[PDB]
Symmetry: C3
């Protein structure tokens, strides 16, 4: 079976579930392709009104793998960018992050319209842990959605934060026990789906406008700085020591 | 007696009290006219420094009536906009929302410089409950003042939130028991009124500048989308079922 | 010994400590000159990665003195602006505000990248207490860093807020007991300093860009309004009564 699966929850709410156990929901070729496919299916079914994006087990999304980053130090690969995949979806998305989210994997959820975190799981913008600056419009999205201060500390330190620690810190998203994350998202999705699809699409376009206007330049600027800071002598060794 | 009354609280603090019991402080012709009149009186008295805007009993403001919305589906009336009334006032305003605030009625309070909510009362941007998108620069004002995440959820769902629920959610305004709302506002007003009027007027103009610059386009854009989403076949029936 | 001293904490973290007991860390000529000197020393040592800025005893920074303000009413002096001093530093700064911070002294800390407040100490943007409008891009910086609502109330009232009161209000910075403030800052600094200096400098430039773009006009606009509201008949007497 494909590693990304779409299921119907009723009343126009659907769930896209990532389950690439081999990569722990990393940005593997099969995850990228399965996300593209499932979002294509969503775009084609006019009856769908809300997407719930979620992981499996202990993982929401692990982002780019350390093996991938090592390949990148040799100039073997370029930067993965799944933002267009998520941002192109015209109906509201709730990211039910029932498991850990690291780097690009945290951004993947934060690109969504609503986000739910697990109390027990760990979340990180870990770029600076490896010693280099973010990609993916990290600063734009984190400042908008987590607030400038959490965004600042998470980006500078690159550390792992449990959901509970983020809640205690006043993160402006719900943080609930792992076994309740998906249920919470589903309940919110059903409330949202009470509205006509036309109104949901129109509202989302309106609400998303300001960030969408700023997104391309944000991606470009982060990419440019990333290319300088990633390609420094000591980075390969720093990545090696995180395995 | 007129349904909107102005009283003096001392030291330049004044109270404008809405009491159209027949419409539960809806955007009735008498409320609109009485607000215009009382704000005219304020503009003319140089001794006034702070306005406290409040309701009566269980209601702060009910916004546009369901009867009005039904008339609108027939093209009988156009969209009410009380923003200019509030935003034109040059001295600070505290909205003492001791009662419920629905739709335009919640926005009416949020146009103020300071806002106090009742723990027991209910608050909603209920446009999407009826199935159509907001008016009144709802997204601009809610994102600025409640934060992007509360704003997102309240606008998408259209649901009723008690003050207590909003406080638990980390709303950045004081939320106190209903019997304490007006007193809290009055105490804050007296602190503010310790400053020279010239300085209050100058400061408010400075602080209000960025939102005021964005307001006209926000109103226009919301109006345009509203006209499309309001005029869809199923909306009249949705409004009917909310009586 | 000089009233501002630089010490090394290890791993590239340094501490700049203000101790002008005679002015309670006011914007005295010796504080201004000692801050300039110590930040020059920092700029010249490539091994330094994080600056912790702190006070002594009960005071972080008292900003402009009342004696200074009285001199200003006579047109004896112009407005002090230490923003360029702080904003020019290319490495991250943590303001460990273990003591009180008043007026420009609160802004001095808030210009930093990270800020830690004492539970027991008092904080104020006290301009309006004297009866005149802020300087130093107060509204820009407070709205960005404390949030629009705390910023609004603190600026309008000019009152003294204990750290504890700000924490209860949901301020988005850590607030800890006075005896723990510097330790907390030092611990955060050591986490930050784990990154390569090149990456810290690049990230800070990127993150600071939007505020830096807006800063000059903010300073200019506040200065212009300040000049009008400060030079009103009753201000000298208001300042007199705050001694
Ligand atoms: Cl479904
Ligand atoms: Cl009065
Ligand atoms: Cl050191």
């Amino acid at each position: 079976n494909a590693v990304v699966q779409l299921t119907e929850l009723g009343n126009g709410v659907v769930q896209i579930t990532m389950k690439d156990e081999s990569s722990r929901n990393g940005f593997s070729p099969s995850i990228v392709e399965g996300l593209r496919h499932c979002f294509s299916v969503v775009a084609q079914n006019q009856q769908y009104k809300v997407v719930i994006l979620t992981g499996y087990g202990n993982y929401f999304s692990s982002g780019a793998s350390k093996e991938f980053l090592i390949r990148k130090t040799r100039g073997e690969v370029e930067v993965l960018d799944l933002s267009g995949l998520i941002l192109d979806c015209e109906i509201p998305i709730i990211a039910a992050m029932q498991g850990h989210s690291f780097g690009g994997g945290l951004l993947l959820g934060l690109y969504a319209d609503f986000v739910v975190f697990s109390q027990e799981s760990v979340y990180a913008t870990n770029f600076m842990k490896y010693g280099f600056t973010p990609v993916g419009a990290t600063s734009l999205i984190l400042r908008e959605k987590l607030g400038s201060e959490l965004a600042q500390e998470m980006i500078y330190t690159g550390e792992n934060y449990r959901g509970k620690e983020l809640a205690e810190r006043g993160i402006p998203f719900p943080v609930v026990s792992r076994q309740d994350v998906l249920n919470y998202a589903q309940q919110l999705g059903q409330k949202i789906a009470k509205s006509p699809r036309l109104s949901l699409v129109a509202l989302k376009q309106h609400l998303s406008a300001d960030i969408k206007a700023k997104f391309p330049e944000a991606i470009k600027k982060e990419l440019e700085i990333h290319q300088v800071t990633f390609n420094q002598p000591e980075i390969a060794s720093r990545i090696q020591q995180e395995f």
